[model samples]
Target chain A: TGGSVHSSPAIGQDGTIYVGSNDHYLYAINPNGKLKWKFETGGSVHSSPAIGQDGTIYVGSNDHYLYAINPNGKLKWKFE
Target chain B: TGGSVHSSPAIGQDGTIYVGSNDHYLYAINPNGKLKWKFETGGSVHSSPAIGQDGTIYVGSNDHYLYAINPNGKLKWKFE
Candidate 1:
């Protein structure tokens, strides 16, 4: 089953599901509902992800920060 | 919702903007920025709305509740 996906997931243009958890991380799942990768953050991953027109995934955390991650599961940048 | 709206809204296929607000409501604004409808809840709606393929809007409230609203702005359901 899925973890604490309380952050509410969003689907990218390519069908990847992006979600956050209380475990202080963000996850990218394939269309089949399996984990592709997870990115760790400093605080609870509570904000829902927003897929931008540029395909960048933007989300916020209780860590008092905002992040923009690439589709490849890489951290692009974060605003602390 | 956010009065005229102050949050980053989720766009539906019909070009409607679903946004949350400090006013404890979720609003569906038409493409022309007219208020289509609004759904009130218990607390501030800080969590941005997430749009489904079917136009169902999912959102969370500071009241520690989650809501599923229909395209027409009626309450489909809510989880406290």
Candidate 2:
């Protein structure tokens, strides 16, 4: 919760919560509300995350790019 | 435009506007604002649509189902 969270939360099958914040990061929280990880972007993340079939998280940032993050919170790829 | 449209629109690569409505349908409109097609669900469609890289459209309905529709306005699948 670094900044305003305008995006809705997306819950994974394993109970992990993923959300975007105006803090310019995507935060992954455990079911107990503990922080799992936070991935930074160049700009605010205003769009909600979309989870893929393989557990990949896809989200867009106002930085003009779309990011694919692995379930482990690593960057898989990014597109502009 | 059969009912209230609360979902944000997703624009396809070809400029088609995809939106969900309380009318229990997802609509595809051309750039000219003419209806291309509409796919009906069992309940109000309140969630915005997400388009896949391959042009598949995904949306959710209050009917407790998520729908996957093809670009041609045909049903690909539905999950609860």
Candidate 3:
């Protein structure tokens, strides 16, 4: 039900799937076939997400930056 | 005398080179234009090898697992 996927996906401990798409959005989908939320980005995401020990998600985009999002789907920081 | 190199190369302290290739083998070449050894794998090797601080080599393959080879061209372990 999502747009074209272009980035490698990451899976959490609870099976929550996080992936980026050419649609310019980062989507978090639950195991039960439901979307948790989406975060908008400026460009396409081509890299995979790396999950930290504290559940912080780190991902890079073709926008030439890295972004950190917390577990609750909120922006924590961005590095250029 | 090489088919094609498809994996990343790692350099040793003494300039020994290690890499895998589509030839279904891992090759070790010395800096002086000499072939040290070659190890056979069932499938094509596409992953890069990571050198440990102790000079051990670790690599993955499309054969569906990781391999840990010693510096002396011996098999230390293979993890599926």
Give the Cα lDDT of each candidate.
Answer: 0.74, 0.78, 0.67
Per model, how many backbone clashes are there? 0, 0, 0
**Residue A21 CA displacement from its true place in model 1, Å:** 6.9
Docking class of 1: incorrect
Q: Considering DockQ, which of the candidate structures 1 and 2 is the better prediction for this target?
A: 1
Summarize candidate 2's per-residue lDDT along B1-80 as a digit string, tens digits.
Answer: 55544454576777666777667888776544467899989998768898999999999999999999999999999999
Q: Higher-lDDT candidate among 1 and 2?
A: 2
Candidate 1 has an lDDT of: 0.74
Error of 2 at A35 (Å): 0.6
Using DockQ as the measure, the top candidate is 1
lDDT of 3 by residue, B10-80 (tens): 78778889888877677788999798888776656655565555666655555643455778888876543
Which stretches in model 3 have alpha-carbon errors above 4 Å?
Answer: A1-80
> What TM-score goes with each of the models?
0.56, 0.56, 0.52
Between candidates 2 and 3, the DockQ winner: 2
Report the lDDT tens digits of candidate 3 across residue range A1-80. 13334344566666556666555667666544367877887777645577798888888877877989887899999899
- Steric clash pairs (candidate 3): none
- Count backbone overlaps in model 1: 0
**Per-residue lDDT for A1-80 in model 2, tens only?**
77999878888889999988889999999999999999998877766776665677766666655566889999977543
Error of 2 at B26 (Å): 16
Q: Pick the candidate with the highest lDDT.
A: 2
Q: Give the range where candidate 1 chain B is weakest over 10 consecutive residues by summed lDDT.
A: B1-10
